[PDB]
């Protein structure tokens, strides 16, 4: 008859009490600067959207980064710029500093912040329980920030986080995939990477919302204390349901499908099965227990559920007692 349809919990309405202006970016007029003004130093990484380059203004001396822009769909470049601009300033946000078009191929670039990122081999290894509390709530004051600003970023995993650890600075980036959330909007299923996708993309259910960020943030976070890169491990997207089923149990997961009236993919008939809701404990061992505890357990259970509408929303997740140590510090 139809699947169930479904509203955030929070910040449901924040976009439809703005002006049209503020999520209509299919009508964002952009400025393009001259990429003239920058030269670029040398490639700090690629990937399927963008190559991003260190690079210097020339006219001011400084260091900064620039995004070139593989082609993607022209709505989508106005989406990412429309969105940096209204977070602009936001806690822990990327900052959009220019928006340049090359001379002569004509092809698009966005210029950033450059951030001294701290190199993540030797970062591994140097992580402390604090560390990884300190800096998982310097996550979710960019996630709430840009949920309560009507944004849902639907691409947090590891390399989309940057680390500064000598000044304890944090950065939020790649905004690529992020869109405007609308109560009763169906979204594209097909986004995020393999690992951090949740249950609400793997089960093709459109309706979803900022929890589905929760979810990625849960994968980072069991990763981090378990050091299990990554935590699901699937081989594909139909795996990646069943290697979540083998460790959330297959009873919750068909109660999820039932509540939403989700038509399963017949693919999945015979991959799923029956499999018990493991205990945490299971996945702790003398290399990592030491950032493993109960409060840790705690917000991890209360971070991956299959029901979008119960995992924590961002602001819950800070009051947790996991940060209770961070958070009086910040005094
Ligand atoms: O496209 C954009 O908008 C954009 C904007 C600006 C920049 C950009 C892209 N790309 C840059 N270079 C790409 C490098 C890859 C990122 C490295 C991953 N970082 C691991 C990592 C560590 C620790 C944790 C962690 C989590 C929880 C607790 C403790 C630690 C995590 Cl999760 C991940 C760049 C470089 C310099 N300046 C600006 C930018």
């Given at each position: 008859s139809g699947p169930v349809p479904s509203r955030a919990?929070?910040?449901?309405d924040v976009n439809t009490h703005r002006p049209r202006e503020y999520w209509d970016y299919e009508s964002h007029v952009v400025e393009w600067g001259n990429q003239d003004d920058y030269q670029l130093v040398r490639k700090l990484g690629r990937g399927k959207y963008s190559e991003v380059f260190e690079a210097?203004?020339?006219?001011?001396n400084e260091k900064v980064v620039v995004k070139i822009l593989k082609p993607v769909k022209k709505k989508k470049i106005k989406r990412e710029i429309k969105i940096l601009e209204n977070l602009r300033g936001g806690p822990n946000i990327i900052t959009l500093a220019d928006i340049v078009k090359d001379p002569v191929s004509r092809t698009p670039a966005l210029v950033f912040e450059h951030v001294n990122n701290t190199d993540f081999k030797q970062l591994y290894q140097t992580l402390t329980d604090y560390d990884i509390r300190f800096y998982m709530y310097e996550i979710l004051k960019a996630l709430d920030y840009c949920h309560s600003m009507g944004?849902?970023?639907r691409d947090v995993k590891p390399h989309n986080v940057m680390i500064d650890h000598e000044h304890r600075k944090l950065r939020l980036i790649d905004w690529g995939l992020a869109e405007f959330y609308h109560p009763g909007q169906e979204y594209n299923v097909?986004?995020?990477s393999r690992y951090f996708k949740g249950p609400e993309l793997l089960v093709d259910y459109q309706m979803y919302d900022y929890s589905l960020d929760m979810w990625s943030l849960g994968c980072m976070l069991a990763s981090m204390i378990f050091?299990?890169?990554?935590?699901?491990?699937?081989?594909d997207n139909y795996d990646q349901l069943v290697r979540i089923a083998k460790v959330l149990g297959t009873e919750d997961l068909y109660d999820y499908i039932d509540k939403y009236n989700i038509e399963l993919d017949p693919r999945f008939n015979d991959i799923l099965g029956r499999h018990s809701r493991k205990r945490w404990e299971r996945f702790v061992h003398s290399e990592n227990q030491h950032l493993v505890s109960p409060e840790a357990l705690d917000f991890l259970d209360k971070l991956?559920?299959?029901?979008?509408?119960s995992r924590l929303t961002a602001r819950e997740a800070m009051e947790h007692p996991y940060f209770y140590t961070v958070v009086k510090d910040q005094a």
């Amino acid at each position: 008859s139809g699947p169930v349809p479904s509203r955030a919990r929070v910040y449901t309405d924040v976009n439809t009490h703005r002006p049209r202006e503020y999520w209509d970016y299919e009508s964002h007029v952009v400025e393009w600067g001259n990429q003239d003004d920058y030269q670029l130093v040398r490639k700090l990484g690629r990937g399927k959207y963008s190559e991003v380059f260190e690079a210097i203004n020339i006219t001011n001396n400084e260091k900064v980064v620039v995004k070139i822009l593989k082609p993607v769909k022209k709505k989508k470049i106005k989406r990412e710029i429309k969105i940096l601009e209204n977070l602009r300033g936001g806690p822990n946000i990327i900052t959009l500093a220019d928006i340049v078009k090359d001379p002569v191929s004509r092809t698009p670039a966005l210029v950033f912040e450059h951030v001294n990122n701290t190199d993540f081999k030797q970062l591994y290894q140097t992580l402390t329980d604090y560390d990884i509390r300190f800096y998982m709530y310097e996550i979710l004051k960019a996630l709430d920030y840009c949920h309560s600003m009507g944004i849902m970023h639907r691409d947090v995993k590891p390399h989309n986080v940057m680390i500064d650890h000598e000044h304890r600075k944090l950065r939020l980036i790649d905004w690529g995939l992020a869109e405007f959330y609308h109560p009763g909007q169906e979204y594209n299923v097909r986004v995020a990477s393999r690992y951090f996708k949740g249950p609400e993309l793997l089960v093709d259910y459109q309706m979803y919302d900022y929890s589905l960020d929760m979810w990625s943030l849960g994968c980072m976070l069991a990763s981090m204390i378990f050091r299990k890169e990554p935590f699901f491990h699937g081989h594909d997207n139909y795996d990646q349901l069943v290697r979540i089923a083998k460790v959330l149990g297959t009873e919750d997961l068909y109660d999820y499908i039932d509540k939403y009236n989700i038509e399963l993919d017949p693919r999945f008939n015979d991959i799923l099965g029956r499999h018990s809701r493991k205990r945490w404990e299971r996945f702790v061992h003398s290399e990592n227990q030491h950032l493993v505890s109960p409060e840790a357990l705690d917000f991890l259970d209360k971070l991956l559920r299959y029901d979008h509408q119960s995992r924590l929303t961002a602001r819950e997740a800070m009051e947790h007692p996991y940060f209770y140590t961070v958070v009086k510090d910040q005094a």
